[PDB]
Design a protein around this nucleic acid. Sequence first.
RNA 1: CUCCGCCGGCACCUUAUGAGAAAUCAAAGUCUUUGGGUUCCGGGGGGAGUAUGGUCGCAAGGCUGAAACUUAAAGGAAUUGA
Lengths: 95, 214, 70, 128, 202, 76, 119
Amino acid sequence: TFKRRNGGRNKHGRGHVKYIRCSNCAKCCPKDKAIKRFLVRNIVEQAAVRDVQEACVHDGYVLPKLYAKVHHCVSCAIHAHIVRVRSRENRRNRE
Amino acid sequence: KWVPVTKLGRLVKEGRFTKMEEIYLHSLPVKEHQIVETLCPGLKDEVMKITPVQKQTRAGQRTRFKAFVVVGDSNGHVGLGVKCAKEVATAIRGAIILAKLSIVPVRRGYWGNKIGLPHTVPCKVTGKCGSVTVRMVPAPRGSGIVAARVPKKVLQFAGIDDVFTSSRGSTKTLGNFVKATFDCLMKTYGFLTPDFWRETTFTKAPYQEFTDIL
Amino acid sequence: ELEKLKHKKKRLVQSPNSFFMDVKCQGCFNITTVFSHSQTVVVCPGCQTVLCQPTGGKARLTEGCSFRRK
Amino acid sequence: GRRILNDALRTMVNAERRGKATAQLQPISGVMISFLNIMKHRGYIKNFEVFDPHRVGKITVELQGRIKDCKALTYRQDLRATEIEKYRTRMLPTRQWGYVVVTTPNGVLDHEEAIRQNVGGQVLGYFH
Amino acid sequence: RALSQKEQDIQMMLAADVHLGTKNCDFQMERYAYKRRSDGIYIINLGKTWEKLQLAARVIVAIENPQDIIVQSARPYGQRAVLKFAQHTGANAIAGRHTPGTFTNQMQTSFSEPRLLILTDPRTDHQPIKESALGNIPTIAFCDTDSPMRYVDIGIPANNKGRNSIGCLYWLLARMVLQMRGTILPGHKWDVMVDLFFYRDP
Amino acid sequence: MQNEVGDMVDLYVPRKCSATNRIITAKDHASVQINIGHVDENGLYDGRFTTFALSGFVRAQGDADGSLDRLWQKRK
Amino acid sequence: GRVRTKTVKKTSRQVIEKYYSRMTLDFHTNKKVLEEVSILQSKRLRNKVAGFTTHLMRRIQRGPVRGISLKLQEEERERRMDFVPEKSALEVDEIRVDKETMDMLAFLGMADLPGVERA
RNA sequence: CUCCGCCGGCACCUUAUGAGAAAUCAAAGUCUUUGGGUUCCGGGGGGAGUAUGGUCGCAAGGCUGAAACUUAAAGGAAUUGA
Ligand SMILES: [Mg+2]
Ligand SMILES: [Mg+2]
Ligand SMILES: [Mg+2]
Ligand SMILES: [Mg+2]
Ligand SMILES: [Zn+2]
């Protein structure tokens, strides 16, 4: 039995893909297999943004934003619910 | 009594058919089994195997019996029925119903010399169902049916007289084995023979010929 | 008819996509024959200006070089 | 590599089985057209073009759907006119129809022709 | 001079915007689409559309009893087209949802053995397609430039997703079948006007 | 077909697809038989129709429509 | 925990099919309507179905409703079904299309048409 | 950069009319209607890539590689249940 068409990693036309480190357990998994999300979070959540616009010394100042491209392995992604086990049929779609 | 629900059943009830040649020639879906008794009178049915299949549930494992019946008159009509049911007898009945629904036409041929009625299959035919494949090869007059007990019991209904049988795959699984035999028969009218070469003059379908009674 | 978009060697009777073109410049009112896919710079014998630049496909003409297929 | 008279027949089987009206053949041969002459003589394909402009060649046959299977026996056999009799049973569907085409010193010809002219040769292929 | 039935009918289809297919095409019916506009949607030879319309009309008329013909439209843009088509041609329209098993389950309440099956869309009405493939049921389907036209015997190349086109095309079939059967005697006059087939939404 | 006596032994010489010439077997429930009427003059119909038959193969490909078309352009 | 079962809802729709002008909004009036127009075996089921039919009233009386079919509403929906404009609203006297839609007609030989114009 | 077409790539999406034990595959199709050419390679599970012999390597090891005996199943795919 073969669980997936591409094996869980998108590797065609290559022989080796440079590995990376999980952001949680530091496991070495290939860059084309790691669950890679580009999280862009506020510095503070919206219940503490009025309170910082009431403290910025210069008016018209916009809050910076944290841009960071976190990597996870499959183990940590499943465990932290980044991704979930989907049915045999729903498994295939990429949307 | 009957009160047929398919208009084929209606026409058969008023008896404006005589033999299943027209229904076969027009490839119509036969949906009421009580057409075929009135259209094929000399019909004989035998069950061969009752193999019990078992689904397993929380409480235990629940058994059903499925029946493999062959029906057919010894003149080129043979039909296979498979039916799974709780009880042996009702499995037999449902199988015989589906089998008399699955009557199909088997064409015969001569080995080399066209004297007497046709006895052997027209040519080499192959039928496959799952893993088992069966071949019938034409045989000269008076060589019998060389085949296993199952396809020989199919062919003795099909009316074939002489034939050479070569089989592949797991012939022990009687379901696939008899279904491959039947698939190898019901495709003997699938062979573009030179004898068919003359282009066909069409015939009105039963619906448009017996329209006014609909 | 699609037999012109269809590949060079997949047509019914395979035929070239190229042609010989007579190029005539602005500075030297004579005619010189050049090939569609020139592969080599060619210069007018008198005026010595370039007629074409080799390219992966058809050669590139210089400004004011009128050419007739032939 | 190419070992045509298979590249032609397998194209013809594929075209027929898909129901295409005409099939074209990229290389040709005197042997190829002599095979198609056997088919057309025995009434299995209708007439056809032989595009011979300048090269190996090209052909276009029109299929009438009357053919059912046609093959080449590359690994071209030796074949006596005493022992075709167990090739006809070994390959052809029955003893009434189907033809085995064997090349013989009298050119390409089918096995029934080989019975009457009593000349054997090498199997080019068959069709039925 | 005068006009031909060609003239009037092609004008009617230009008006009801039938010639405009969509962005895509299927190799099966690319033979009807003629050229692309640079915006990207295809357009259909309405002459070839009307040729197929005559084909379908002859097939309809060759039916002895029109009570054995079923026409379907699952798009709500076509129910008012199909019932008006049905009451005129004597056919039997099944508008709305198609209950699966209509053509096979013999002791179903909604059973029938139609001589012929007309569909506004093979794509949406693909269920009747599949049952027709099991019931020996010839089919005339209204194929757009996106129509996956498996199991279709006669396919009219036409837009079938518009407020006007579905109403127009069934009105063409209505008039043509009625001319064929002669209920409207020779003469382009017919006492039914097209905007009736357009669906009247609340 | 023909017995050597001349008697005819085989039953329902089956109809053949008009577009691909493979024969419709007795259980190709994906096979259809179109009737196309003929129109003559005032009235524009009588019970004179041409008949076509198509196997499951041709329909399943989808190219059944092209077959009906290209066989309807035959004249008489 | 008060959802009505099929023995309730089927009966409510079926009785509201047949008896519309003869039953009204008021719960108790519908009770006594149902007494003479149906035979049941429990006063609580009687109350149950009457109380479902009463808001079936309160929904029908303001807007349309699913399958349940009544002549006094289907006939009017047919009367507003079958109307047409005084003349066909789509007019052929002016048709505005582009070059390829004209190529249609030109390939069909029809370079000249009534009412076809260049955009 | 937009559009259309050719080749040659890496792939992907839909469908059997095909194939398959199926999973699945547009190439694992054109296979009992069996034959384009060619190399390597398997013959139930163990014992075992083990012993012995050879050979290469500094060594680890690599390549080549059995038998005795034992066993009625081992195994693949999919179904239901737990
Ligand atoms: Mg590469
Ligand atoms: Mg690697
Ligand atoms: Mg072993
Ligand atoms: Mg397993
Ligand atoms: Zn991790």
